[PDB]
Structure formats: C-alpha cells, structure tokens
Design an enzyme around this catalytic site. Structure first.
Site, PDB file in Angstrom:
ATOM      1  N   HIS A 202      -3.728   1.619  -4.648  1.00 41.10           N
ATOM      2  CA  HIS A 202      -4.056   2.894  -5.268  1.00 41.10           C
ATOM      3  C   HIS A 202      -3.751   4.013  -4.271  1.00 41.10           C
ATOM      4  CE1 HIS A 202      -6.360   6.155  -7.172  1.00 41.10           C
ATOM      5  NE2 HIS A 202      -6.194   5.464  -8.285  1.00 41.10           N
TER       6      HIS A 202
ATOM      7  N   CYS B  41      -4.988  -2.323  -6.678  1.00 36.78           N
ATOM      8  CA  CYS B  41      -5.720  -1.071  -6.501  1.00 36.78           C
ATOM      9  C   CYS B  41      -6.286  -0.967  -5.091  1.00 36.78           C
ATOM     10  CB  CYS B  41      -6.806  -0.936  -7.573  1.00 36.78           C
ATOM     11  SG  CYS B  41      -7.325   0.768  -7.853  1.00 36.78           S
TER      12      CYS B  41
END
Lengths: 188, 188
Positions: free
Chosen positions: B125, B105
């Site tokens: 992400h 992420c």
C-alpha cells in the site's frame, strides 16, 4: 445523526458480497449490523468462510429502522432469504417507509419472492436473470450497478466494491464515497 | 494432487483482503486453511467483521507443507504477523523449500520483519512504502500486483481480486484462473 445499515446473513451467502459492503460501509462511518437470519450463531458461507453475526435478525428487527437493508448473494443464501417470513416483513416495511433496499448477484431474486419493488429496473448475476424475470415484473439491466428509485442492485462478487460505494453515495453523498474510495486502490 | 494454501489470520487483519483470496482460491479447487495466529478462537478483523478460523496456526503448522502462504494486510494485523516467532519459522521454511509467499497491502512489511526475500521487487500500500523500504533491502514497484521469484505482493483492498487470481495462476495455471474469473463479473 449516524446512518444505519442492516446486512442480513444467511447460510450459503457469498462471503465476499457480505464482507466488502460491511467493511466499506463502516469505513464511511455507517453503523452496520450484520444480522444472522437463523440466530446469533456463526454462519457458514458459500465458500466455507464462517462469520459471526453481530446479532440475530430477531433482535436487530427491534432496533430499526435502518437507512439501508442489504441482501448479499450466493444461490443458497438467496434461497434462504426468499423463504423467510421475517425477511418479507423487513423488506415490506422498508419499502413502505421509502428506505433504501440493496441486493447483489442472486440477492435480488429475494425481492421477487417477497413482491418488492415491482416495476423497477434491476440487475442480477447473468445466471440469475431468468429467475428474476419470471412474470416480467421488473425491467432488466446489464449495468454493473443499477439504481431505480429505492432499489439498488448489482451483478456479482466483482461488482461488490462499486455496489458498496453506491450505497455510501446514496446515504452519505458523493464526497464521502470519494474519500473512502481513495485508500482502497481501486482501478477505476 | 491438490494444491494447499495457508492463510494466516491475526487480530486487526483487513477482512476483505482475507476473504477474497480464501474464496477465490477455493473456487479454484485449492485446499485453503485459514489459521488463527492466536489459536482457534474467532478473530476480530480491522472493521469488526469476526471470522472463525479453520484451525490454530500451531495445528496448521504440523499439516504442512503448503504451496502458498498468504499474509493479509491491515496495519495492526501486519504488526501482529511481524512480531510472531511462529510466522518467522513458517516463512523461513517456505522460502527454503522455494514455496510461494503472497502478501497484500501492509502484509509485505512482515517479510521485512522476518528478513524474507531480500533483493526482491515488491509492492505495498502507498502508506506502507516507507516502512517496507527501511534499509533499502527491496526494490519498490507501483504495479497493482508484483511477482518476483517466489514473492508475490499487491497494494490494497481494491487489488485483492487481481492478487488472488495471480495466486491461482501461479498454482493452477492460466486456464483455471480464467475459468474462475469469468463468473465473478470483474471489469477487466
């Protein structure tokens, strides 16, 4: 105007099935209380993750009522939930006031122990099916998430996201669930 | 003969991205150490789940080396990882001995801060892409899990299971990962 969720956390609970709904529900603006069955002390989950609850179940009970009561799975966690008189009282009260009850994996076997929602369609982890179906008091489903009336069940750690978003949709509606879902990078 | 994983846990970490890999890795028989960046004290994660680490990073550092170092995401968690000199030392040592480094992420932006794995293909992400790509030191991928050499990255909370099973496959091989996967009730 804020919805409220009670997550009951017992030793042996599946930590993924606890943290995913708590996290996702808080992303949806729900006020979540993680309540330790045995008190305020840290809880050792099934794979040795140790989580500090927000409150004891005793104290959280007094700050009801909750729009959803959430029962994580984990074989030993679910057995502790099934043996607790405090859990029985909470679930019966929640059933009476027609509040949502949500349980995942082995969690639903606590509903059977406490005679909750008989007649409903439910799902469990495949390994917990026989236990849940003892007596034929429920109808079994193999859907990843199942919702019948006020009983919402789900099958396993890998269904935890779908389970949590179903709670959000039931409490806050479909648009909030879709808004919360997008930043998560879920496949479907 | 037991493989060993170091998970570095800092305030503001995404608790789902921490617990899923820890849980899945322990299901695979990997010895996992959840090490608190700031010490042994409980860590407040991004959505207020409080996790007790197994050890301080200082103590865990002395019990190396680890077959994988795992960096969870969470914007503020990743910023704490990026600012820590102890993390820099751990990652540089891991790169030198050609050990696996895994980040999810926002976690990969700590690799940039510490000048780790330049030239590798990585994912993050979507909201962390610009930060990761500052300087063009990496090549960006939009795959849910990306593995280039010894750098394994993944995109978000919803890719956490695929991320964790990729670690298992890299450490213990494809058959163990498949065995661990089946009881989880993952869709694909």
């Amino acid at each position: 105007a804020s919805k409220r969720a009670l997550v009951i956390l017992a030793k042996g609970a599946e930590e993924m099935e606890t943290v995913i709904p708590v996290d996702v529900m808080r992303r949806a603006g729900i006020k979540v209380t993680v309540a330790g069955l045995a008190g305020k002390d840290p809880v050792q989950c099934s794979r040795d993750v140790v989580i500090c609850p927000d409150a004891s179940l005793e104290d959280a009970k007094k700050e009801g009522p909750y729009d959803v009561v959430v029962l994580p799975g984990g074989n030993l966690g679910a057995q502790n939930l099934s043996e607790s008189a405090a859990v029985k009282e909470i679930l019966k009260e929640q059933e009476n006031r027609k509040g949502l009850i949500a349980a995942i994996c082995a969690g639903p076997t606590a509903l059977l122990a406490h005679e909750i929602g008989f007649g409903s369609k439910v799902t469990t982890h495949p390994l917990a099916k026989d236990k849940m179906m003892n007596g034929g008091h429920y109808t079994y489903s193999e859907n990843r998430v199942e919702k019948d009336g006020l009983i919402l069940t789900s099958r396993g750690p890998g269904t935890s996201f779908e389970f949590a978003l179903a709670i959000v949709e039931a409490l806050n509606g479909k648009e909030v669930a879709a808004q919360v879902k997008a930043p998560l990078v879920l496949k479907d």
